[PDB]
Structure formats: C-alpha cells, structure tokens
C-alpha cells in the first residue's frame, strides 16, 4: 500500500515504519539486530561488522516470546527536506536519491532449538509510514526492488 | 571638540580552549544570524555528548558450550579498553581527550532454547579478579542467567578507581574487568543445539572528559 | 452487539480511514527520553496493532513550506488525469466510449494509467465527474457530444461508425454542440445518473458488465472533408467535491498497471 | 557568543541587506555646516567602515517624480525577462529545456542576458516563477506543455526529438494544451517543487548538475504539416512575490555576461 | 488472597539511539550512585559538543611574497572539508555522523613587518567563486588586511547551502571556499624580508550533527 | 536516567552496604502465623532477590549481653592486627 501511493509522487519525507513479524515455535530461541545505516540508496555496506553496526541507530529483538512483532520507526534523517522518486530516471546521479539509507538484518544470537522443530524461522516485513508527506503528483508503476 | 574614531589596537579572542592575543587588531565582521529550520531537515536530537558517547555499543560476543566446564571463563573483558576503538562512535570523543571519569551500564544477553538448561554469572569486577573466590562473585555488581528463567541481565555502576580518572592513550590498569563464567554446566537432551551464542553491550554514563590532546598512543 | 451476539474481548476499528493529515504540520518531541513501548507489539491482535509505533527519540517535524496538502484525494485527483484518445477517418461518423472502472478492460479499450490505478484503491464510487476533452488537428468541423447513462440505448462502444440513433434521441439525453475553429476544448460535468447505488472496478465478469460503469460519452463529427488534416480527440477526467469514495481495497499489483504508450 | 566563543572587541553586521530605499525620498541638510567626520575612516575595520560617508555640505535631495521604486527586485524582475527560444522542423516532435541558474552553461544552451546576470547576484533561490511563452509563426497547431521537477524522468534536454514518454506520464505531472490559432501565448506559474531547500547558479561541476536547477519545461507539437510556415517558441521568466533570495554574491564579471545575439 | 511476586517477562530498554526488546527479561541491578568530586581531579569544562567541536583549529598556512602579483590567489580552501580530518578533534564528532548543519567563524592572521607594505583580502564564498568579479569580493563576508594597519581579520557566518545539511563521508559541493588574494602588491625596500607567512583558523558554530553512522567513506 | 537511557522495568540497589546491625537487638515475632511469602523467589531478578527471606515462624531474638557490636569494621579492625 505504502508503495502504491508514494509511487505517484516526486517527493516524500517522514518516518517509514518497518514491522517485523516472526513465525517461530515456543521452542526456538534467538535474537536479531535491526540496523539503520543513514545515507542514500546505494552505499556499499557489506563491509560492516555486526559490532560496527551498533554505532548506527538500531534495535535487537528476542524472537522466543508472547509478543510477535518489533516495530522499527526509522526517523527522517537527511541532508535534504525531501527525497525524490528517481526510480523513473534512466540512470542514477550522485545526490538524486530515493532513500535516506539502508536497513540491515544481522544475526545477534544464533538460532537454537531441539530437533523436532524446523531448522529455521521465517520473518515477515511489513511497511507503513507515519508523519508521511508526499507532493508533486506524477505517474509511475514502481517495479520490484530485487534486493 | 569632536573625537574621531580610530581602531582598537590590542585585543583578545578565542573559543573553547584556544586563545589568541592580537596587537594590531580590528573588529570582527559578521553577517546574518542563526536560523532555525521551520521545517527540520532531520528529526533526531542534534549530536551531543550523550548522543554519541553515552549510548550502547556491542563490545564482545562469544559462545557457551556443553563442553564448557563449571566456572569456565566464557569471557574476560577490559570493558573500557574495548570501547576505546575506532569501531564505535564514542571513540571520537575519547580519541581526543587525555583522561575521563564515568559510570557504566552493561547489558549481557543470550538465547538458550528452553530445551537447554544451566546458567552463567556476569560480574563487574574493578581492576582484576585477583584471587577472589569464584563462588563469591555475587558480591560484585552482578547479573545471573538461568535458562529456565531469564535470557538477559543488566548492571549499572559509577566510577570506581584509585585514580580520579582513566587515561586512555596509555592506561595504568583497566577500570573494569567484566567476567562471565559458567554458573551451572549447560547440559541438554540428545538432539538439541549444543551451544548458545552470547553478546555484551556497554555504554558510558555521566561521561566527564578532560584535556583535549593530539596524541593517539 | 445489537445483533444478539456477545463477546468477552473487545472489538476496535481496524484500518480507519483518513487517520492523519498528508502535510508536515502540528495537528517538544514526537517521542523520546521516556521509553519506546510502541517498539513492540503482537500485530496479529487488531487492538495492539494500533498501538502507535515508536522506536527512537525524535523531534516534531515542523511546518511544510507549501499551502495545500497533496495527499487529499479531492485535491490530487482534482488534477484532471488522462482517460483515452481516438481519431476520425471518414466524415459524418461517431465514436462512443464508456467510462468503466473495470480492472479487466485493458486500454486502449479501458481505463489507463492514473485513472485505472485510482479507481481500484476502493470498492465503491458515486458522484458527478468533470470531464474535459481536447480537440486536436482539423478545423471548422461541427461536432456534438452527449452523456448516456448505464442501461440505455447507445451506439456500439469503442467503435467508429455511422450513428444508428435518432437525432432526437441523442439531443434528448442532454447534449452539446461545438466547432473546432471557435474552441478546441470542452469542459462539461458528467452526472451521477445511474440505477445503482454506486459503481466499482474490481468485479467478476457478470457484475463487471453492469455495475462497473459510470456511463458513456458519444462524440459525433460533421463537415470533415478528409481532404483536410486528421481529427484527434483526447479525454481527461477530474473528480468533483460531490464525489464519494467508500471502502479501501488493496491497490492493483504493478503488473496490472497499464498505460497507453504513445507520446 | 552561544558557541562558547569570547572576544574583547565587538562584532557588527557587515554588508547588511536592503540598507536604503531606491527612490529619492525622505525616509534641513543630509550633512553640512558641522564637520564631516565621515570623510575619514579605516576601511579594514568592519565597524568603522559602516560610519556614514560625508565629505561636503549637501541638502536633502527631495522627492522623485515617479510612483514605484525601480530598484525593488520584486518590481524589477517583475518584468518577465528573456530566457530562450527554439524552432520545430518536423511534425509530432518535442523540445525539453531546463531552467538552470548555472553560470557555466552558456547560451543558447543556458541562462542568457538579464536572467543570467540576476541569478548570480546571490547564492540561494527558491519559490515559484511565472513563466510566459510566446508562439511565433504557424497556425492551427495543437500543442502541450508540462513542468518536470528536478530528479525525474524527462526527454533529453536542449534537443528536438520524438518524445519517449507515456502520454500518461506527461499529463500526470500537470500539463496544459493549447492551439496556435486560438492564442499565441501562454502565461503559467512554475511551482517550487524540489527536494532541495533552494537552488544556485554559482557552483562546481557536480553540484552544478543537481542543485542548479529549478526544474524543466517540455513543449510538444502536433498537426504541423511542414508544408506550412515555421514554428518558433520564445520563453520569458518573471519572479513572483513568493520568491526568495538569500545571500548576496559578487556579480558576474562582464566577460561572463553573454547574450543570445539575434534580433 | 496473597498474590506472590513473579518476574516481568517482556520489557524494553536502551539509551540514545539503541533499543532492545527482551522477551524473557528481569529487572536491572544497580549499585551506588553518581559521585561529585569534592575535590575535582580536573578543572576544565567536562567534554561537550562545544568543548570539542565548536572550538578553533589551524586549517592551512601559506606564504605571501613580493613575487605574488595582484589578485594572485594565495589560498583557496574547502574550509569544511579541511576540518574533516583526523588532525583535529572535531573529527571525532563528524567521523560518526552522516550529515550536519552549522555556522562558521574564520580568523586569518599574518605578520608583516612595518617595513613591508601592501594588503590582502579574505572572502568566505559559498560553493565556488564561479565567475564573480574579483574586484567585488568585498560583497562576500570578508576581511581586509593592510600592513600599515591590521594583521588580523575575523569573519563569522551561519549555514548557507542548497541542502539542509552537509554530507561529510561523500559531499556534493563544498559549503564554503575561503579565498585569499593579493589586494595590493606587497612591495618593500632593499633589505627587508620579502615575505610573510600566513595562517587560517576555523571553528564550527551552532553545530547540529545528525544520523550516527559506521562508515568512513 | 540522566544519561539519556530509558527502561520499562525498574532498577533497584543491589547488595547494599551496611544492611543490618551486627549485634542481636531490636532495631511479637520476626515472621509467623501469617504465610511465608519470602520462602520463594526468582534469585536471577535483583528486585525479587531482595525480598526478605522467611521460611518458618520465629520469635524476636532479643538483646545481646555485650555492649559493642563486634561486626563494626571500625571497632573490629580497631584491634591493631
Ligand atoms: Cl482560415
Ligand atoms: Cl459504418
Ligand atoms: Cl527523433
């Protein structure tokens, strides 16, 4: 939804909200660290120790629990009042960015468990925004971001 | 008789810890003033000592195994020394001040599956463990971990040292040596994961920095 | 519950319409130096899920520099968007195109771009619409146009042919006449004249044939000796204040968003 | 100083904006029969330099004969000045020109004459602009134009070619249609739609490619059998009251002031 | 009926920009409290944003010669970019924040012997000098230097940019380009020193940092 | 927390110095005929762990026969060792 709307605007600003829903069993145990690295939509980030990531704003979540979703409210951090929908342009230009940085999912504590339960745990990532503002109407059907 | 304005020779300017004495001076020119964003370009608290220095950072991270015998030291860390490192933002403050006094907050967490059992103990010991009775670690500001119960512990302490501050560039003895040992052997049933990783979080509190310096070592 | 039903746990509103404004304004901090309780929740529970999200300390955004809020449907769709376009080949002929929300009917024989997108964001629509049409090419061409409501006689859709309707009938439904020389564009309002309560885009075959249409427009030319240039027509629609929109749907997936690629 | 700085001598405002009015009026003598102390000073000192200049006994100038003050930027630049001009050669083609303050981009592919001069008198600009464009030549030519904001898709600049954009897309950004026969000129306002706080002319390469542009205009013709006359377009810009100008720069040296010499 | 205390499972902790959600939690242990030195171990203001970031630093330093012709650029500096460098403490703050907005204070000084004559002009130009008339540099926030008169000048400005902040790690265009040119050829009598060295001081003002980041480039 | 930190659960004093006197005195019963809630706790939790231990009904100890409290460091180490 979030996308289908904003796709029709040139500019946007606000707090994007990432909701992480875990689908485990009362028998798994683990922690994941969510980390927002302020910047633009194209910053090599693979060279970042988990430790290194704790410098940027982030949050850790214990999966095993009575609760199921951690909400990541990514504060509007930019050098500009609004970001632009460059996803329409042919190529990319230093400064014309769509995002305010990238989010990273690290393995905080390895996933432990017995043996009569899955060898993993899937996670859903919802997206919505608050204090959202978009302006300058346009038409474009955003395609998929193949990570 | 009309007096006619002539510049003011001598004068003294500066900011923070930098002073200038000028003999053939003149006045300073300024234009406009500070403007406040009617529409902020960023909503996070503007950088401050607390922002960048009094926040949490991941220090060390190890494993706890079924192979680890009772009292096995799963970790021995010079908390302070560890923070002092480019890896963390707080460095930017430390790297430029010679000494500093402070308190600390430690958060240790793990993730044992309810099919695991056992526990650990985490203690904030000043200086060195010396020859203290392992069994009396509870005396130090500590946190106990029990699989069947909690998977986290938090300890908070103030500045405790023989000196009025810690010297980063070239320390005397570590302020704090956080120790983590096996409090009750971690056993399990055939099939369960035979381990659980563990992390350690730390941050300064009431960070008092002193004496700006260009050194690095 | 007046329906003779009972419960022990509550029932709160889920996904409530028009929750917040669309322009940065203050309707201190937005959250901070307290404790972000809204950082954790059980999304499966409707109540809990509404708990306001908050993860880190932030400050109040402030005031946007521009007057109007671009996210108000009325103002946004207030920009007459593109609908369709056709071209006449022979003289004394006519074209009749329907205004159909149908997600099925793909352009050019259907709703395109923005209009297509918009009308599938919700289930029900009703209310007048301000159609405006631009004339391209020719000149000194007399023309006429009329709005025909769903369920009545009207020349075969999406097809240029010689009208099969009594001049009387045409004019009777309320019509307009114009000439390319003196104008080149027409902005007239389309009425909410339908036997239905409302219309919809997302439907299945059957209903998708009766309940997915506002109505139809028919344009008939005259005095167009093809020794002349070509005659093109372009139509655009803009939503009015008397227009209503009920029940939000999941937006059309990208693969179904189509546009009449031209220039 | 709130910045933790200290000083023993003062700090006064240097080169303050809008110091005096631009029309002869009284906002006795202006100086005289006293002693001209403002005849001497130490220009190196910012304070002293502000001391009002006075050398001989003069009288008050009086009142100008004309109503408005020609030196008020708003009123002066209120005169829509020249921007650019181009000409179409084939039918169904389009031209897209950017509005760039860049002192670098030399005309015709850049800001000319007055506009060039003006936009380099200060560092930052922001706010709407009233563009007005004159059509020359042809007739019965249908046309369309749209404003495209910095950072979005748009046909290649300073070049006449066949558009490569979905009619949908074009119209979507807000557009206008017109015909040479019925008009011959268009005055529409350009919005301050940019992800930047403001734009600037004086920059260096990189920034000079992103932060030096208000936006872009695109004009597309149709029905222009070149058996006809030629089709010329001329664009002029006028600053609006909602326009702002921050921080005065040293004016461009004469050698850099260029004009598109024609007629 | 007496209710018996049982721990509080779920909970949320953190500090500054680091939050933790724990499901099998427990309470935090703390000992003692903050102590204030009845006898301070150091008398300087405890480190703070202003202490370490809003103070002065020596940027660049060059020579002005008798050989330098009129308008000769004695220095062209990206003030901001220059501060961003390990060499100065303020780095510690910049090195860890992605963007930041601010004002600047520049102090330029020299030491010409009264037997020398001539002068220079120092201007704070935003972005680039472009093709501005060298002769109109006085328009920009400037400071004029004349041997027979002053040997120092000070300029103070606020944030002036097209964007709401400067991006250090990877900038768009320099915020400020301080230019220093010969305003009147520096001549002398036979025997006098044919030069005078020159330095440039800079410091941030109203330093607003934003978005902690681990990057370096 | 003045250090810009936040929490949802509390933070109590752990292992507090000089908690009780060192000589039998009254600073009824000490616990009894009620219900020993302090017989159970979750030692891992700092708060709960401070809950006063009590398992069976006891009476107040009374008064020690000697003046000074031998457990006062000052007095104990007061004996030059
Ligand atoms: Cl004619
Ligand atoms: Cl036919
Ligand atoms: Cl072409």
F interface with E, Cβ–Cβ below 8 Å: 1-16, 35, 37, 40-42, 44-48, 51
Q: What are the residues whose beta carbons fall under 8 Å from the beta carbon of A94, sequence distance 6 or more?
A: D206, D210, E170, E172
D142 touches D94 (CB < 8 A): no
Angle at B101 between CA F14 and CA F13, to 5 degrees: 10
Q: Which of D149, D197, D210 sits opposite A95 (nearest CB)?
A: D210
Which residues have their alpha-adjacent CB atom under 5 A from ion ligand 2? Answer: C 161-162
> What CA–CA distance (Å, rounded) separates D46 from D206?
35
What sign does the CA torsion over C174, C180, C182, C186 have? positive
For residue D263, report the distance from its CA to the centre of ligand 1, in Å: 29
> What CA–CA distance (Å, rounded) separates D246 from E161?
10
**CB-based contact (8 Å) between E84 and chain D?**
no
E147 touches E114 (CB < 8 A): yes
Count how many Cα atoms sit within 13 Å of the Cα of residue C196 in the half-sphere of its side chain: 18
Q: Does residue D108 have a cis peptide bond before it, meaning omega lies within 30 degrees of 0?
A: yes
* CATH number for position C53: 2.60.120.20
Residues in F touching B105 (Cβ below 8 Å): 3, 5
Report CA-CA distances (Å) from F4 to C38, D238, E18, E51: 18, 51, 11, 19
Q: Which of B5, B14, B32 sits opposite D6 (nearest CB)?
A: B14
Angle at C23 between CA C18 and CA C25, to 5 degrees: 105
Q: Which of D153, D174, D206 sits opposite A89 (nearest CB)?
A: D153
DSSP letter at C42 equals -
Query: What does the radius of gyration of chain F's CA atoms come to, in whole angstroms?
Result: 18
Give the helix ranges, DSSP H, for C66-222: 73-76, 113-118, 167-172, 207-210
CA dihedral A77, E174, E54, E100 (to 10 degrees): 0
Q: Are B24 and E149 in contact (CB < 8 Å)?
A: yes
**CB-based contact (8 Å) between B21 and chain E?**
no
Query: What does the radius of gyration of chain C's CA atoms come to, in whole angstroms?
Result: 24
- In Å, how far is C14's CA from the nearest CA of chain B? 29
Distance from chain centroid for Cα A20 = 9
> What CA–CA distance (Å, rounded) separates E182 from D169?
54
- In Å, how far is A8's CA from the nearest CA of chain D? 9
Residue E7 Rama label (left phi>0; alpha psi -120 to 50; beta): beta
Which chain B residue is nearest to residue F46, measuring alpha carbons?
B143
Angle at C109 between CA C108 and CA C115, to 5 degrees: 70
Count how many Cα atoms sit within 13 Å of the Cα of residue C90 in the half-sphere of its side chain: 8
Angle at A49 between CA A43 and CA A50, to 5 degrees: 105
From C165, B210, B205, select the one nearest E42 (Cα to Cα).
B210
Q: Are F45 and B50 in contact (CB < 8 Å)?
A: no
Residues in A touching B95 (Cβ below 8 Å): none
**CB-based contact (8 Å) between B28 and chain D?**
yes
3-state secondary structure labels for all residues of A129-145: EEEEEEEEECCCCCCCC
Q: Exposed/middle/buried for E194, CB within 10 Å: 0-12, 13-18, 19+?
A: middle
Query: What does the radius of gyration of chain A's CA atoms come to, in whole angstroms?
Result: 17
For residue C170, report the distance from its CA to the centre of ligand 2, in Å: 18
**CB-based contact (8 Å) between B55 and chain E?**
yes
Residues in C touching B43 (Cβ below 8 Å): 30, 58-61
From C60, D193, C22, select the one nearest A134 (Cα to Cα).
C22
β A69-74/C81-88 pair status: unpaired
Query: How many contacts (CB atoms, under 8 Å) link C and D?
Result: 63
- In Å, how far is D80's CA from the nearest CA of chain B? 30
> What CA–CA distance (Å, rounded) separates C9 from C217?
52
Q: Are B199 and A76 in contact (CB < 8 Å)?
A: no
For residue C161, report the distance from its CA to the centre of ligand 2, in Å: 4
Q: Are E21 and A39 in contact (CB < 8 Å)?
A: no
Q: Do chains D and F have 3 or more beta-carbon pairs under 8 angstroms?
A: no
- Sequence-ordered strand ranges (E) for chain C: 29-31, 40-41, 58-59, 81-88, 94-100, 122-126, 129-137, 142-149, 175-179, 185-190, 213-222, 231-239, 244-248
Residues in A touching C112 (Cβ below 8 Å): none
Which ligand is nearest to the Cα of residue C139, counting in written order? 1
Q: Number of structural domains, chain D?
A: 1
**CB-based contact (8 Å) between B139 and chain A?**
no
What is the full DSSP assignment across E25-55? --PEEE-S-----SS-S--SPP--HHHHHSS
**CB-based contact (8 Å) between B84 and chain A?**
no
Q: Are C55 and A74 in contact (CB < 8 Å)?
A: yes
From D241, D146, D237, select the one nearest D193 (Cα to Cα).
D146
C interface with D, Cβ–Cβ below 8 Å: 65-66, 79, 81-82, 85, 112-114, 134-137, 139, 181, 183-185, 229-230, 232, 234, 236, 259-263
Angle at D202 between CA D197 and CA D208, to 5 degrees: 70
From A102, A144, A106, select the one nearest A7 (Cα to Cα).
A144
For residue C216, report the distance from its CA to the centre of ligand 2, in Å: 20
Q: Which residue range forms the structural domain that includes residue B1?
A: 1-217
C260 touches C113 (CB < 8 A): yes
> What CA–CA distance (Å, rounded) separates E142 from E153?
8
Residue E134 Rama label (left phi>0; alpha psi -120 to 50; beta): alpha
Which ligand is nearest to the Cα of residue C155, counting in written order? 2
> What CA–CA distance (Å, rounded) separates F46 from B103?
19
For residue C143, report the distance from its CA to the centre of ligand 2, in Å: 18
Residues in C touching D243 (Cβ below 8 Å): none
Residues in A touching E19 (Cβ below 8 Å): 58-60
C225 touches C89 (CB < 8 A): no
Q: Which residue range forms the structural domain that includes residue C172?
A: 1-263
Count how many Cα atoms sit within 13 Å of the Cα of residue B147 in the half-sphere of its side chain: 23
As a 3-state breakdown, chain C gives helix, strand, coil percent values, each rounded to 5, of: 10, 30, 55
* CATH number for position B83: 2.60.120.20
> What CA–CA distance (Å, rounded) separates E39 from A120?
58
Which ligand is nearest to the Cα of residue D139, counting in written order? 1
What sign does the CA torsion over C240, C241, C244, C245 have? positive
Length of chain C: 263
Q: Number of structural domains, chain E?
A: 1
B103 touches B206 (CB < 8 A): yes
Q: Does residue C108 have a cis peptide bond before it, meaning omega lies within 30 degrees of 0?
A: yes
A70 touches A34 (CB < 8 A): yes
- In Å, how far is E174's CA from the nearest CA of chain A? 14
> What CA–CA distance (Å, rounded) separates B140 from B124?
6
> What CA–CA distance (Å, rounded) separates A10 from A136?
5
Q: Are E29 and B54 in contact (CB < 8 Å)?
A: no
Instruction: State in Å, rounded, how far the first CA of chain C is from the last one.
Output: 57
For residue D181, report the distance from its CA to the centre of ligand 1, in Å: 9
For residue C142, report the distance from its CA to the centre of ligand 2, in Å: 19
Which chain A residue is nearest to residue B90, measuring alpha carbons?
A55
> What CA–CA distance (Å, rounded) separates C218 from C149?
11
What is the full DSSP assignment across chain D? -TTSEE-SS-EEE-S-SS-S-SSS----EEE-SS--GGG---TTSHHHHHSPP--S-EE-----SSSS-TT-HHHHTTS-EEEEEEEE-SSS-EEEEEEE--SSS-TTSS--HHHHHHTTSEEEEES-EEEEEEEEE--S-EEEEEEEETTS--PPTT--B---S-HHHHHHT-EEEEETTT-SEEEEEEP---SSS-B-SS--TTHHHHTTEEEEEEEEEES--TTS--EEEEEEEEE-TT-EEEEE-PPBPGGG-------
B27 touches B8 (CB < 8 A): yes
> What CA–CA distance (Å, rounded) separates B56 from B106?
9
Report CA-CA distances (Å) from D183 to A117, C182, C235, D134, F55: 76, 11, 21, 9, 100
Q: Are F45 and B150 in contact (CB < 8 Å)?
A: yes
Q: Are A57 and B61 in contact (CB < 8 Å)?
A: no
What sign does the CA torsion over E81, E82, E86, E91 have? negative
Length of chain E: 217
Residues in C touching A136 (Cβ below 8 Å): 70
CA dihedral F67, F68, F70, F72 (to 10 degrees): 160
């Amino acid at each position: 939804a979030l996308a289908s709307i904003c796709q029709m605007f040139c500019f946007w600003r606000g707090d994007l909200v990432f909701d992480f829903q875990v689908f485990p069993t009362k028998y798994h145990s683990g922690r994941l660290l969510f980390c927002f690295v302020p910047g633009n939509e194209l910053i090599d980030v693979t060279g970042i120790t988990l430790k290194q990531a704790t410098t940027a704003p982030c949050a850790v979540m214990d999966i095993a629990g009575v609760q199921s979703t951690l909400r990541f409210r990514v504060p509007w951090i930019s050098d500009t009042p609004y970001r632009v929908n460059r996803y329409t342009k042919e190529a990319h230009q230093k400064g014309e960015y769509t995002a305010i940085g990238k989010l990273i999912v690290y393995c905080y504590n390895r996933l432990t468990s017995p043996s009569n339960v899955a060898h993993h745990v899937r996670v859903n990532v919802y997206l919505s925004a608050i204090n959202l503002e978009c302006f300058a109407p346009l038409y474009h059907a955003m395609d998929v971001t193949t990570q | 008789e009309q007096m006619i304005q002539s510049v003011d020779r001598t004068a003294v300017t500066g900011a923070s810890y930098f002073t200038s004495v000028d003999q053939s001076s003149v006045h300073t020119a300024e234009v406009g003033s500070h403007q406040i964003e009617p529409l902020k370009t960023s909503v996070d608290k503007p950088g401050s000592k607390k922002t960048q220095g009094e926040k949490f950072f991941l220090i060390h991270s190890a494993r706890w195994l079924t192979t680890h015998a009772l009292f096995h030291e799963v970790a021995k860390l010079d908390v302070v020394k560890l923070l002092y490192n480019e890896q963390f933002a707080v460095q930017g403050l430390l790297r430029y001040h010679t000494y500093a006094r402070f308190g600390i907050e430690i958060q240790v967490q793990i993730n044992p599956t309810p099919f695991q059992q056992g526990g650990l103990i985490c203690a904030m010991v000043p200086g060195d463990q010396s020859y203290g009775s392992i069994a009396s670690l509870t005396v130090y500001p500590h946190g106990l971990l029990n699989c069947n119960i909690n998977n986290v512990v938090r300890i908070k302490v103030p500045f405790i040292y023989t000196r009025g501050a810690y010297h980063f560039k070239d320390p005397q003895y570590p302020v704090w040596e956080l120790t983590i040992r096996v409090w009750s052997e971690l056993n399990i049933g055939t099939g369960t994961s035979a381990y659980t990783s563990l992390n350690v979080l730390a941050r300064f509190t009431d960070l008092e920095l002193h004496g700006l310096t260009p050194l690095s070592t | 519950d007046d329906s003779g039903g009972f419960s022990t746990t509550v029932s709160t509103e889920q996904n409530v319409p028009d929750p917040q404004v669309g322009i940065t304004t203050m309707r201190m901090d937005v959250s901070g130096v307290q404790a972000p309780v809204g950082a954790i929740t059980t999304i499966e529970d409707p109540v809990l899920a509404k708990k306001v999200p908050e993860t880190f300390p932030e400050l109040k955004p402030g005031e946007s520099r521009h007057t109007s809020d671009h996210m108000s449907i009325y103002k946004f769709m207030g920009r007459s968007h593109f609908l369709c376009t056709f071209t006449f080949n022979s003289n004394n002929k006519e074209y009749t195109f329907p205004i159909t929300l149908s997600s099925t009917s793909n352009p050019p024989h259907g709703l395109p771009s923005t209009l297509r997108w918009f009308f599938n964001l919700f289930q029900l629509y009703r209310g007048p619409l301000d159609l405006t049409i631009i004339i391209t090419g020719a000149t000194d061409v007399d023309g006429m146009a009329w709005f025909t409501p769903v369920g009545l006689a009207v020349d075969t859709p999406w097809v240029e042919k010689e009208s099969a309707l009594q001049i009387d009938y045409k004019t009777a439904l309320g019509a307009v006449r114009f000439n390319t020389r003196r104008t080149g564009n027409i902005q007239i309002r389309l009425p909410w004249y339908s036997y239905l309560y409302a219309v919809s885009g997302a439907l299945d075959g059957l209903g998708d044939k009766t309940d997915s249409t506002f109505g139809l427009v028919s344009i008939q030319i005259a005095n167009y000796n093809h020794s002349d240039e070509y005659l093109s027509f372009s139509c655009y629609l803009s939503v009015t204040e008397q227009s209503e929109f009920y029940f939000p749907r999941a937006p059309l997936n990208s693969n179904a968003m189509l546009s009449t690629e031209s220039m």
